[PDB]
Amino acid sequence: DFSITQFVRNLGLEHLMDIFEREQITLDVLVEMGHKELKEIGINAYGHRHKLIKGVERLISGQQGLNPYLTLNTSGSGTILIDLSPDDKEFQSVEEEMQSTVREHRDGGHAGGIFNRYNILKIQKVCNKKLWERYTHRRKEVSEENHNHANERMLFHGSPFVNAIIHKGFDERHAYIGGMFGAGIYFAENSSKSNQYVYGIGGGTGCPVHKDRSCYICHRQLLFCRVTLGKSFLQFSAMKMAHSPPGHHSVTGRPSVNGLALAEYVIYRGEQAYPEYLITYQIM
Amino acid sequence: DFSITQFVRNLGLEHLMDIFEREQITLDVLVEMGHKELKEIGINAYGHRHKLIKGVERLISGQQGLNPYLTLNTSGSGTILIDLSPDDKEFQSVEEEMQSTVREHRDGGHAGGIFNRYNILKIQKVCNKKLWERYTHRRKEVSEENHNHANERMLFHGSPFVNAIIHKGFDERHAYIGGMFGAGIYFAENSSKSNQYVYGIGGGTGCPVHKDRSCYICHRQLLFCRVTLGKSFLQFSAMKMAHSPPGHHSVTGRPSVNGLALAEYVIYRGEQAYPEYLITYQIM
Amino acid sequence: DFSITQFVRNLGLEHLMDIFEREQITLDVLVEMGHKELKEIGINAYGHRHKLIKGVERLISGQQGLNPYLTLNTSGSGTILIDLSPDDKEFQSVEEEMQSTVREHRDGGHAGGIFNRYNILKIQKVCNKKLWERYTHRRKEVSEENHNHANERMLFHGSPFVNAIIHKGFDERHAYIGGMFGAGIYFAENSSKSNQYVYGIGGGTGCPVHKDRSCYICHRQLLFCRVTLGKSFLQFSAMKMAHSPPGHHSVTGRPSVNGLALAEYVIYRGEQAYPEYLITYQIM
Amino acid sequence: DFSITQFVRNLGLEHLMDIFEREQITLDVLVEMGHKELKEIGINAYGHRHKLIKGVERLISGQQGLNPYLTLNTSGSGTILIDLSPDDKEFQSVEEEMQSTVREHRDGGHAGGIFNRYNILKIQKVCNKKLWERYTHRRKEVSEENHNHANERMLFHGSPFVNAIIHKGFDERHAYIGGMFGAGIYFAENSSKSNQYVYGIGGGTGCPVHKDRSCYICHRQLLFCRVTLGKSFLQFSAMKMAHSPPGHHSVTGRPSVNGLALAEYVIYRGEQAYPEYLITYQIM
Amino acid sequence: DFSITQFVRNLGLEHLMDIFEREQITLDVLVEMGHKELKEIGINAYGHRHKLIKGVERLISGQQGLNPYLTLNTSGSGTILIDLSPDDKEFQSVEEEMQSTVREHRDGGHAGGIFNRYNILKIQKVCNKKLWERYTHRRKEVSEENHNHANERMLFHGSPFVNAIIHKGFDERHAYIGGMFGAGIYFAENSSKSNQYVYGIGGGTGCPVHKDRSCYICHRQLLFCRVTLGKSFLQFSAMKMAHSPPGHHSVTGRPSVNGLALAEYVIYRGEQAYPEYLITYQIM
Amino acid sequence: DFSITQFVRNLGLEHLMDIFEREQITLDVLVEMGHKELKEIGINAYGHRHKLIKGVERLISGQQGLNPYLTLNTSGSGTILIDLSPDDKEFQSVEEEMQSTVREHRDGGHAGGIFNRYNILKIQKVCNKKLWERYTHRRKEVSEENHNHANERMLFHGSPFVNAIIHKGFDERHAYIGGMFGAGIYFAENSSKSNQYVYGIGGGTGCPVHKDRSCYICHRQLLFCRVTLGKSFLQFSAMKMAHSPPGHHSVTGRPSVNGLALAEYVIYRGEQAYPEYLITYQIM
Amino acid sequence: DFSITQFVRNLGLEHLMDIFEREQITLDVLVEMGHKELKEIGINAYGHRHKLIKGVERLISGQQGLNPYLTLNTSGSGTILIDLSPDDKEFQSVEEEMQSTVREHRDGGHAGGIFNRYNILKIQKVCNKKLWERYTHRRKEVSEENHNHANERMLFHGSPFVNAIIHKGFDERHAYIGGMFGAGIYFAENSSKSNQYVYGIGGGTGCPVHKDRSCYICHRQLLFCRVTLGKSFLQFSAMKMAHSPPGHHSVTGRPSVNGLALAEYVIYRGEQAYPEYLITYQIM
Ligand SMILES: [Zn+2]
Ligand SMILES: [Zn+2]
Ligand SMILES: [Zn+2]
Ligand SMILES: [Zn+2]
Ligand SMILES: [Zn+2]
Ligand SMILES: [Zn+2]
Ligand SMILES: [Zn+2]
Known part of the structure; x- marks a missing residue:
């Protein structure tokens, strides 16, 4: 709580600091306040509010090349996980999509397991401002091409780094280079196929607690994702x-x-x- | 319990959580609170309230495409039934409709049974915000056509799926595809005609307890419904x-x-x- | 008490029901309670009260077209008769009007009987909220015309239907269609004139117990009514x-x-x- | 005009009059102004605005029994006619209802003339706040009495007193006692039937210019009206x-x-x- | 035309008409003007602007049940065609997906004609506010019912009634009752299949001028459409x-x-x- | 072309078209005009300007999901090339960098030919706003990920597809997958190494005219480009x-x-x- | 207080001082106020605002040679340090650079210390308006040469005058005249090489508290700086x-x-x- 103190002192307004101390005004809060807000907290003289606002301008816009605004506004960022209630239509929609998309695979449950259903434990909406803005900017860009159509789908994804994805987002720099179609991010319309990648490509070593790929005890996690396909290239062979x-x-x-x-x-x-x-579930 | 925790922790305000625990503030309640409400529950510092309000704004408006506001605040959705007092004017009006609209049919009660009166047990008002809004939107849409007149009537409806109707609303996807006028939902001026379809087409199996289409013991249910007819087409032939x-x-x-x-x-x-x-009754 | 239970269960607050049961809170009571009242009955957490109040708003104002408020507020309506104290000035004024407006009619008491005075048994003030509101709304309409003057008077009314009038109000649909001025409701400045109609048109068959139009034993009922005459048309012939x-x-x-x-x-x-x-009396 | 001058003079604020004169503030305008509006027009001192607002409060609320508010609000009330464009769907639907309801009649076009269709010249929406408020209040009453249904219909009305109806509303005091159902106001769902009454009972004498009932040149006027029928009594004979x-x-x-x-x-x-x-048309 | 005159006269502001006439202010314009706009056109007195704004409030908000605002604002509605420049990427993408979707059919080119590619004359964006708002309201509904996903696709449609569609919008009341999947509106992934239906079911009698189904002389038209598919039902047979x-x-x-x-x-x-x-093309 | 006509006609303002045609106003130009701009070209009445502006708002803001604004603004886009004068300091410094960074190479001039310096014929600045905004957006992303440092360099690039690059910009989908560091875009700080590529990898087949890689007559083109390296990974082997x-x-x-x-x-x-x-040069 | 008093007194507007005193308007504030701002604080007469604004004009522009605008508004200048949070990506990037750019030096920590990693205590963004203006202007100058490329890099700097640098900026007048390349300011691409100069050239006397070089107890400070290298001369010898x-x-x-x-x-x-x-750290 010293950047506010230096800023106020440089303006010759140190006698106001007591107010700023009681109202918990930090510099990031101060840069977002105008005459109305400053009047609310008790800066009653027009001259003081004028000095504060002009100083905020000289810091934020006058030195924009330093980007002090982004240094101040690290607070509030990050990911939040909001639980869907089982009694809601959204939860039931996602659950029906999970259940109705199970299919028979070529391996007898070696990678994913031997199952015909899931026991869903919880489903969580992932909320992240920065990731959402990045995605929407790219989607708008793709739609400006391709005759104003994004071609947006909802698809499944399975991987051992789901936490890293939901916090940092998808990164092609971690792409699956060994895939059948090159080094990209892979999505499937059948939840049972994305199940094959939860504990590792081809099931890896299985669940950590039992080393069993077909474990019926341990929790799994899948991502159900918006994917902007744009103009999609049709391929059959690898x-x-x-x-x-x-x-x-x-x-x-x-x-x-x-x-x-x-x-x-x-x-x-x-x-x-x-x-x-973010779907948490067990195989049955 | 947890989503509010993550939201408050991301803002650097987790020291406030002990307030939110005693006031039972969840995220769905929090997204509706302004400076007045936050000051009431004991957030006395202006800066803390500013940060909470800005975080809520970023969550709700900055990620509108994810519709977190619809994931939140699902509480309160659903149907309720309010019992009419038999001494009330409205109860007597509905009962008078029920009784006075009885008529003789071409068949001697083969489908609806044999009766001249009903014993009304109770009448319930059906209340559901979502369905009401859907209906009134369609009503304004039809009224904008047909010169500002919706042509709204009160009509009886009979079906074995009344319980589904009062929770999910009328649905043409279940329509009576064998009806005399095609795949629509049917309504009648006469309660006695609607009574024919309570147990199924042509009375169906009758009551589940006697398999009798003229059972005088166990109860029947009819709906009394607002119906927008708009520009109605006259027909006489099937x-x-x-x-x-x-x-x-x-x-x-x-x-x-x-x-x-x-x-x-x-x-x-x-x-x-x-x-x-919703009307519950026996035939006499 | 099932409607309140459904309402509270939809909100997820069924753990509060044991409070509502003990305080006898019904839905018509809950729709009238705010933060103060809910705090009185023991709802201490702000989030609980907030959810209750928001549910009430979504029910009452959100579905106003269904009028659930009118369904709930049927109780408490109706008429109450408040007996006047015979030692009060009000009783004495009403009795003075009765006694002093008697006149000797043309017929020798054929319709009203032979008498000079009454024996007043009791006088009651008629109190009905909805009827009074109907009356005052019409009085306002009539005085908006006729230069801000309602021309309100107090006049006697004799009828065999006074018990229906004090519960449902005056009604022109039951009008004296054979009257000498047509299908209106008739009022008199003389109590002895209204006494000619107590048992029916022209006295009818007399009292039901003696069939005597001059029965000095059986009780009679007159109404003393506030009548809004507005601009009155002066007529001398039928x-x-x-x-x-x-x-x-x-x-x-x-x-x-x-x-x-x-x-x-x-x-x-x-x-x-x-x-x-409402005046109960005998002739003498 | 001079009422503002007296009002301000009594407050001791006549030095402000030149502002009110230049802003055209009459007493009816002033009674609607607050601190914000009085600031806008140059009353800067708080004491002056306080004095004006308390004077208005004393005039309006302090003498409600004199209804000075209604006296001031005499201006602005009245009927306006909004022309419908022939290219609009409203005009087209009204015209379709007008045309498609023509029928043959018992008499050989004696009252309404010989024709198969009309030629529509104008259709105008009638807008009058006081009449609409009267209508909606009565509609609320009827629907409160008729299990929350007003049974509102769109019906034609034909009369030689259209101008009086659109400027004063429907009035049963003009109802003809010789109608087939007595002293009521009559509406029809066939336009050709209401057309029989535009020039009087039984067609009167015809157009004022020709005295021709079947004039194909002189204009005729019908009204298309919202009618609250409530509970309707079914009758088959006069x-x-x-x-x-x-x-x-x-x-x-x-x-x-x-x-x-x-x-x-x-x-x-x-x-x-x-x-x-309001429909203006010729017969063809 | 005359409605503005009646409105202004009822307020006692006839002297302002010379302004309203010179500035071409109609009533629909006047209802959208505030203090700022009125002050711009020359209404300098505050009292006049106050009275005009209060009159507009009494009309538009006071009589909302008559919907005068919708009788106004009829002007400006309707469809607009915006020509795409042949050099723009939008035109190129639309043409590319037209040309790349040509495919052989089971019939020997009887229904659509003998061709391998198209000659494109014009591509026009169709703009209509009310149709777009209807579409977006339904898209919102579907997405809320489908875990926040509209499943919006871009698809081809062919019909002889394209001209009516682009003005009235798609209308299930004109559905293809004889289709393989019932009375619905049909869309194709391949343009060559929608081309089958530009001249009626099975090509009808061919182009109007030559009665040839494979005519290379006449200009055809196809629609490329946003289609909200929601949760689509998969089926393999009629x-x-x-x-x-x-x-x-x-x-x-x-x-x-x-x-x-x-x-x-x-x-x-x-x-x-x-x-x-809206794509205009010839086959080659 | 015809869009302006339809737009003006839908508003009922067709009588203004002579102005729009005379001043060559098109819809793409109309959307940008305000009150001042319209007043300039002779739309003198406030009502007309209001209607035009509101129509533009309905088209652009009301139908935003159709992106008509981007369809209209195809004008004023595309790359342009601006010649640099040899007397200019900028030209001389670009030439200094081009000439001073020649180096020895391991091949006997097989790819880049036998030369020691260049004869530079023209140097051109490339301007294209779309590509510039794309690059600047990416630059801001990278800098925000790299402690506010873009790490921007000027580097040489060579390829046979320079003409395509200067219009459609750099793209990774044409990447040189055969390179020593994978499928990327390659840049060299030495002009000669890039010059090795101007006719294909390893010089390809040489100049098209004579299939000679060391041709001194045919023109050569090389790009001198801004490249954001960000946090650059140090590598030492293939x-x-x-x-x-x-x-x-x-x-x-x-x-x-x-x-x-x-x-x-x-x-x-x-x-x-x-x-x-863009640099055009010959070797010597 | 006095200068604004003299200014206002010369204009004859001393009767406004009570306002200026309450709003804390000093002359540096008044020189930035226009008609709107003066109206906000209670200067309502147009003549007073006009006089104040023209007096400000005559003071500031009429005597620009005296630079009164720079004698005023000196307050608010100076440096502020904004603390980065360890959880921010900016902090992590800077610390990653620090830690990863450690290299083995020739001396056994004689001038620096015997270490392999740092312990970063805090990082601070330095914000100074005047210094930023100077830097950006010189960058513009250098980029007008060197073909619009500043060659701007991020480099480390160590010096005992860091506290003077962050307040006055880099100055060649304090240059290291004894350095290998002469009287210049020296920057490093490795953090350790700059750590060598923290306590002085060759380590100086060591930390003041111990007179110890390689003191693991006392804090050290480094600067991370934007440096405009432009065209750089390569060298390998002094x-x-x-x-x-x-x-x-x-x-x-x-x-x-x-x-x-x-x-x-x-x-x-x-x-x-x-x-x-500005980086503060200890050594491990
Ligand atoms: Zn396990
Ligand atoms: Zn039974
Ligand atoms: Zn008796
Ligand atoms: Zn005539
Ligand atoms: Zn043809
Ligand atoms: Zn050559
Ligand atoms: Zn030390």
Whole structure:
């Protein structure tokens, strides 16, 4: 609580500090106050409010190249997780999407497990201002191309770094380079397919507590995400591409008799997705 | 308990949590509070209230596309039933409708049973904010057509799915596809005609306890509903149609010597009806 | 007490029900309580009171088109009779009017009987909220016309239907359609004139117990009413009007040598009279 | 005009008059102004605004029994006609209802003339605040009496006194006692039927210029009106009434083999109708 | 025209008419002007502006039940076509997805014609405020019912009634009753399939001028549309439905070896679609 | 073309069209005009200007989801090239950098040819607002991730696709996947190393006219570009990579005794560089 | 207080002083106020505001040669230090640079210390308006040369005059005349090399509290600075320059086997650097 003190002292208004101490005015709060707010807290003289506002301007706009505003406004950022009530239509929608999309896979539950249903424990809406703004800027950009159509889908994603995603967001710099369609972020329309990646690609070592991939005891987590596909390139056979082909914004691998068992989507930029829902569940 | 904790911790204000715990402030309550409310519960410093209010604004308006406000504040949604007093003027008005609109049918009570009077046990007003708003929006939409007149009638409805209706509202996706005027929802001026469909088409199985379509013991249920008819199309002969005829909002089947013995009304959009009163009764 | 239970359960506050049960809070009571009242009955957390008040708002104002407020507020309506003290000035004024307005009519007590004075048994003030509001609204309408003057008077009314009048009010739909001024409601400045109508038109069959139109044993009932006459049309001969003449609110039949022996007042709208006093008496 | 000068002089504030003169502040304007508005026009001192506002309070609330407010608000009241554009859907729907309801009649066009359709010249929305307020108050009363349903219809009205109706409203004191249902105001759902009454009972003598009932050149006027029918009494044969039958709010005369060719609606209260549309047309 | 004159006269402000006439102020303009705008056009006195604003309030807000504001504001409505520049990426993307979706059909080019690509003359953005607001309200509804996802797609539509659609919008009351999936509005993923229906079912009799279904001379038209699919119901064979299946908002016709050659999407609500691009083209 | 006509006609202002045609106003120009701009061109009446402005607001703000504003503003976009005068200091410094950074190479002039300096014919500034805003947005992102430092450099780039780059900008989807550091965009601080690429990788087949890589007659074009490196990853040996290393924005391949002879920089985001200067030169 | 009093007295407006005293309006405040601001504080007459504004004009612009505007408004100038939070990405980036740029020096911690990692106690953003203006102006100058590229970098600096630098800025008049490259200001790309100069050239006398070099107990301070290198002259050997080489803006000594162990940068004008971050730390 000293940047406010230096700022006020430089203006010759140190005698006001007692007020700022009682109302808990820090410099980040002060930079957002005008005549109305300053009058509310007890700065009654017009001259003092004028000096404070002019000083705030000289700091924020007059030295914009230093970006002091971004240094001050680190507070409040971050991710919040809001629990959906089981009795709401949103919870039931997400749960029906989870349940109705289970399919028979080629492996007998070696990667995901042997199951036909899920026991959903909780579903959480992920709220992050900065990530949402990044996603919406990219979506607007993609839509300016592709005749004002974003082509937005809701798709599943499974990975062991879900916390890192919901806090830092999707990053193509952590892309799955060994995938069937190159180094990108992979999404699936069937929850049972994204289940195969929860504890690691191909199930990895299984759950940490039992080393069992088909464990019925340990909790799992999936991400249900907005994905902006834009103009999506249709592919059937594997192709190790580093980026989207020219003119497109994602890749769709469709099922084939000799190819994919189930539909798949791939994006090559981490800001074209947003993990809206975090689902906690057990396999049955 | 936890979402409010994360929200307050992100703002650097977790030392305030002991207040929010005693006042039972959840995030859904918090997003509705301004300076006055926060000052009431003991947030005395202006800076703290400023930060809480700005965080709420960022959550609600800055991430509007995620609709956190709809995830929050699901509390209070749902139907309630208010019992009418039998000594009330309104109860007697509805009962007078029920009794006085009885008529003889072409069949000798094959579907509706044999009776000349009802024993009304109770009448309940149905209240549901979401359904009411849906109905009144559709009402304004129809009224904007048809020269400012909605043409709103009070009509009886009979079905074995009244419990579903009073919670989820009328729905054309369940429509009576075998009806004389196609796949619509049907209403009648005469309570005795609506009584025919209470247990199913043509009386169905009768009561579940006797399998008797003229059972005098166990109760029956009818809905008394506001119905927007708008520009109504006159019909006399049976026909099949999926939607309203062009330029019209509903169909009315008039009585005829070689046709209907009693009038009927048909709507093809579930938004145009609201179940205002629920009637429980026995036949006599 | 099921409606309050549904309301509270929808909010997630059913753990408060044991308070509402002990304080006998019904939904019609809850819709009238704010933070102060809820704090009195033991709802201490601000969030609980906030949720209750917001639910009440969403019910009452959010669905005003359904009028759930009128459904709840039926209780407490109705009429109460407040007995006057015979030692009071009010009782004495009413009795003075009764006794001093007697006149010897043309017929030898054929319709009213033979007498010079009354024996007043009791006088009661009639109190009904809704009827009084109807009357004062009409009085305001009539004085908005007729240059801010209602021309209100106190007049006697004799009828065999006084018990229906003091509970449902005056009603032109039951009007004396055979009356000498047409289908209006008749009031008199003389109590002995109104006494000619107590048992029916022209005395009817007399008292039900003796069939005597001069029965000195059986009780009788007159009303003393506030009548709003507005601009009155002066008439001297019979006219079987249905409504008032254009530009007027009532009709005054004046005494004439070849016409009325005594004055009469006729109103063609039942809302223009309020039955203030109910007088029980015998003739002597 | 001079009332503002006296009002201000009595307060000792006549030195302010030149402001009020330049801003055209009359007493009716002043009684609506507060601290904000008085600041706008240059009354800067707080004491002066306080004096004016307390003077207004004493005049308006302190002498309510004299209703000076209503005396001041005499200006601005009245009827305005808003022309509908032929390209609008409102005009088109009203015209469609007008045209499509033409029917043949028992007489060979004796009263309304010989024609199959109209030529519409104008349609105007009638706007009058006082009449609308009267209508909506009566509608609330009727619906409170009729289980929350007003039974409001759109019906045609034909009369030679359209101007008086649109400037003063419907008035039962003008109701003809010789109508087939007595002294009521009559409405029809067939335009051709109401067209029989535009030039008087039975067509009168025809257009004022030609004296021709079937004139194809001189204009005719009909009203399209909102009518509150409440509980309607069903009747099949002529009978004179001064008011509605007990317990009912209107009368409806149905077609019969030995009676009416077309339906009638009759209200006995002038306040139950509002003349929404004024239609000018020629017969073809 | 004359409505402004009546309005101004009723207020006693006729002397201002010379201004309103010179500035072409109609009533619909006057209802949107405040103190600032009125002061701009020359109403200098505060009292006059006050009276005008209060009169507008009494008209628009006082008589909302008559909806005068909607009789006003009829001007300015309607559809607008904005021509896309051939050099813009929007035009290029629309043309690219027109050209890249041409595919062979089961019929020997009988219904649509013999062609491999199109010659595009114009592409026009369709703009209509009320249709867009209807579409967005329905999209909001669907998204709230579908875990906050509208599932909005861009699809092709062909019909002889395109001209009526772009003015009235899509209307389920003109549904394709004989379609494979009942009485719905049909959209195709491939433009070559929608091209089959530009001249009626199965090409009808071909182009009007030549009666040739494969005519290369006449200008055809197709619509490219925003379609809210919500939760779409997948089906593989013919099944006639009047409405969408319970719990779903649309239908998807999946290609099959013995079934559909190409995918279909069907909506049963006119307001779940919006025609964004009107494409004029010839086949080659 | 015709959009202005439709817009003006929908408002009923067609009589103004002679002005709009005479002044060549189009809808894209109309949307930008205010009251002053309209008054200039001769729209003298306030009502007309009000209607035009409100129509523009309804089109642009009311239908924002259709993005008509972006459809209208295709004008004033695209790249332009501005010649630099040889007498200019800017030209001389760009030439100094081009000439002074020639270096020895391991090949016998096989790729870049045999030369010691350049003859520079023209240097051109590239201006394109869309690309500039894209690059500046990315620059701000990177700087905010890199303690307020973009780490911006000027570097040389060479490729056969320079003409496409200066219009469509750098893109990662055409990346040189065959490079020593994966599928990125490669930049060199030495002009000669970039000059090695102007006819393809390794010089390709040489100049098109004579298929000679050391041609001295044919023109050569090289780009001198702003590149944001951010937190640059130091690298010393060959590798394959699709995206930047985690936490890094670019990579630099340094010179080594067993590696690069000269420094290399690589970016994996196309928006992370801008082609400011276009250089045309011959070798000598 | 006195200067504003004299100013107002000369204008003849001393009767306004009571206002100015209460609003704490000093002359530096008054010189920034216009008609709106003066109206806010209670100067309501236009003539008074006009006189004040023209007096301010005559003082400030009429005597610009005396620079009264700069004698006034001196308050508010000066430096403020804004504390970064350890949880911020900015803090983490700066600390990552510090920690990761440690290298093995030749001496065994004789001038610096025997260490491999720091303990960062706090980081502060330095904010000074005048210094920022100077830096940005010099950057603009350098970029007008050097083809619109400032070659701006972020470099470390160690000095016992840090506290003087962050208040007065870098100044060549205090240059290290004995340095290898002469009388310039020296910056490093490695943090440890600058740590060597914290307590003096070659470590000086060590920490004042111990007279100890390599003291692990006492705090140390470094600056992290934006440096405008422009065109840089490369070197590998000492040159003892007094100014920058011709045509160049800075010097840089590159690593060499027989010369510098680490890279180094040198500038010869104090205005070409700005001390963005101030780092306090201990040594581990
Ligand atoms: Zn386990
Ligand atoms: Zn039974
Ligand atoms: Zn008796
Ligand atoms: Zn005529
Ligand atoms: Zn043709
Ligand atoms: Zn060549
Ligand atoms: Zn020490």
